[PDB]
Symmetry: C3
Subunit: 140 residues, 3 copies
């Protein structure tokens, strides 16, 4: 039933931390799969941490993985991501790590192992070929 | 004249606040349409607010809406967006709300109703099917 | 050998500052080309600067240039980009300028001319046609 592809893209994933659920789409059509923290971390205002997600992925060639902040946590507690959107290259086989930062002025954020701390989107990217010109009239 | 599609994608939009202009592209080919604030809000340094834009959209299935900061305000006054890029899912029919934050150290930002506070892009996204493997040799 | 396109997209680029290397992909398949600073700038905690990259590009119509923070600098020193992801429109022929900000609480960041301070991705974008509806049942 499920196994039939209705009228993929696939993303190979390794759970380096098998104790965490696989990243999942909260709903049908959702752009991102939620990434989990493998760890407990407390962020004082303005502090940042490179947080392990416990997964590694193989973004297809011609694509990019993008790590985006979750909007609820952003608003509620000022949780953001320092390098957002995080750029995961096709060639990267390492653990996805999220550079969480507390952008609240005063209140610490506690992240617990098992919390959803970001979302991962996958998009095609143009692997551009640079054409250097001395001015734009010239390139056309 | 206009009505002829030259050699769409369409985006259904509801102005929940009809007193605001429709989001518009500043120029031909611009990636984003500018979102307006429905409200007056003042952000002290480091403060954030979830600001109503007065619109709801229906991002097509297979796509994502992305809320990006405007570069002028970013530079001039340190206005950013906490969860940038804001991720609008295909299924979302609620009001788009922008998590504005003042990243200036010292100077408050006043946003007025009618100000352009972000930009909305629409892109295709890969709705990936996760394939869990025990290691990447295996997935190929 | 090289010159043969194996089984482009091209991006015209002008080095307004010819003393800087052309933006390059660190590796095969990398989503972004790294942008360089044309300038020396020191950012105290919470300060931001609009930094010249010494390049101008012609993003193809139907596409967008996106300026993303580099993850290493984000983590190591709290370097981010205020309007990230920076949105470069197809029509823009000006110099790409990066709104760097120091999100570290306490330690200044020194950027040197020649340092890689961001990455530029190019993606297709949907140049959407807005269709205003009074409610979403109506648009379908
Ligand atoms: O900038 C934004 C981002 C999201 N949204 C809305 C649309 C999006 O589909 C919805 C959920 O976005 P996120 O998934 O980033 N938020 P979160 O994961 O915290 O909530 P949920 O559990 O509903 O996904 O919130 C906005 O109005 N503005
Ligand atoms: O990081 C950036 C972002 C934009 N830009 C340039 C290219 C882009 O096409 C142009 C406009 O970007 P935004 O639309 O984000 N800025 P804003 O809306 O404030 O100005 P405008 O009214 O010109 O659109 O600024 C940069 O040089 N660096
Ligand atoms: O949020 C992120 C971003 C990147 N990464 C990993 C995957 C990506 O392919 C790799 C390199 O990303 P960047 O190019 O943004 N970092 P940087 O340019 O500092 O290092 P490198 O010289 O390796 O490219 O780091 C993460 O784990 N999380
Ligand atoms: Mg979500
Ligand atoms: Mg603009
Ligand atoms: Mg890199």
């Amino acid at each position: 039933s499920s196994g039939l592809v209705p009228r993929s893209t696939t993303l190979a994933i390794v759970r380096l931390d098998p104790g965490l659920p696989l990243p999942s789409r909260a709903h049908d059509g959702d752009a991102g799969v939620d990434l989990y923290s493998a760890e407990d971390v407390e962020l004082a205002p303005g502090r940042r941490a490179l947080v392990r997600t416990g997964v590694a992925v193989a973004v297809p060639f011609g694509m990019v993985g993008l790590v985006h902040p979750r909007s609820g946590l952003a608003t509620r507690v000022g949780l953001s991501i320092v390098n957002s959107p995080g750029t995961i290259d096709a060639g990267y086989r390492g653990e996805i790590k999220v550079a969480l930062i507390n952008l609240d002025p005063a209140a610490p954020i506690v992240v617990h192992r098992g919390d959803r701390i970001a979302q991962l989107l996958v998009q095609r990217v143009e692997l551009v070929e640079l054409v250097e010109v001395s001015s734009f009239d010239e390139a056309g």
